Structure 1
């Protein structure tokens, strides 16, 4: 199963990881140190993109997602509660890399512990419904993930070219497919 059928994957990609379709033209995943890091950035990146592109559409089902910057607790008041909450949370994820188990235990309520788990796939609290089963989901995750990541840059270059959001830029394309491309 390969990004370019009939290719041989590169040596370092062996179909162990979820959504390894033999893709590293610049042996980015070459050193195990870096490939362990890049695994995370590729989860988290999609998770933020999936979350965001999910938002853009459903917030416009309205006004320009792009000029949403302009919206009851001042700017610096809100940027604080983000900063401390995001700093708190991101450090704790970043310790799970620093040492694979180092954090799992509720510093307050130490009765409650997060059970032994693979990196970047934490569960316990964070897997309540224990939904659809095993790896397959992690392969939907990174697929649905990349598509979401791409779509975002879309949504951005779509704004920074048309002026409209995503659903309007599509409605514009439908109206004149032959005309509304980048090639015009």
Structure 2
């Protein structure tokens, strides 16, 4: 039937294949509950879209501005709009849009009306896929496009995790670390930096310092779960 993550596996009973991207991977049974599955579905959608934009941004950044480091690109911008005014505008606008999305989650058909201008509203849609002003120019079918979206999004989530850990253990960017891997495949993999043996543990050092100043304070910038590193 449908392509599963394990070709010979029987999928969990709650995973019947109705969702976009239901490749039968719920070994812990987190989506066994019908009500929490919807929240986890929306969470996957927004994690997917955030990670896709994030990976595209890091890639484009390391293309067109390679002198800056994306792990360091918070303290190497120095906008004139202040470090606090940035946080203020983003906090308020994101609180707005995210509470609107949350009210879409709680009450599905509730928040479609443009509050300021009374004549625009979104059509009745699904939970997680607004459409309307969000979605002009759909190039093809909707279910296949949702499948493609969630697949590229899962790949982008794993890609951002790889970005983070490779920026931590190497201190280089994604494309820079890729050029390092292509410059020495057998000698720059995580297997070639680390090894734990019953008697010896070799964890790679992270090139990210423990703290960065950023204007008179000490921002703690720790490597993710060092110590648990191999």
Task: Give the TM-score taking structure 1 as reference length.
Answer: 0.97
Encode CA deviations 1:93-133: one digit per residue, 9 max, x unaligned: 00011111011011111111101101110011001112222
Instruction: Tell me which of the two structures has the higher relative contact order, counting C-alpha pairs closer than 8 angstroms and 6 or more residues apart.
Output: 1
**Aligned counterparts of 1:127 and 1:142: Cα–Cα separation in 2:** 16
Q: Which runs of 5+ in 1 are unaligned?
A: none
RMSD: 0.8
SS in 2 for 1:135: helix
- Cα deviation 1:44-80 (Å, max 9, x = unaligned): 0010000000000101113111100116111111100
Bigger mean CA deviation after superposition, 30-39 or 126-135: 126-135
1:20 CA displacement: 0.3
Return structure 1 stretches of 4+ with deviation > 3 angstroms: none
Would you tell me which structure has more strand in proportion to its own residues? Answer: 2
1:34 to 33, 36, 56: 36
- Cα distance in 1 for partners of 2:88, 2:54 equals 21
Of stretches 70-79 and 140-149 in structure 1, the one that deviates more from structure 2 is 70-79
Report the structure number with the largest CA radius of gyration: 2
- From the two aligned structures, give the one with the greater helix fraction: 1
Q: Distance in 1 between matches of 2:85 and 2:15?
A: 46
How far is the alpha carbon of 1:28 from its aligned partner?
0.1
How many residues are treated as equivalent by the alignment? 183
| Alignment equivalent of 2:70, drawn from 59, 65, 87 | 65
SS in 2 for 1:67: coil
Q: Counterpart of 1:129?
A: 137
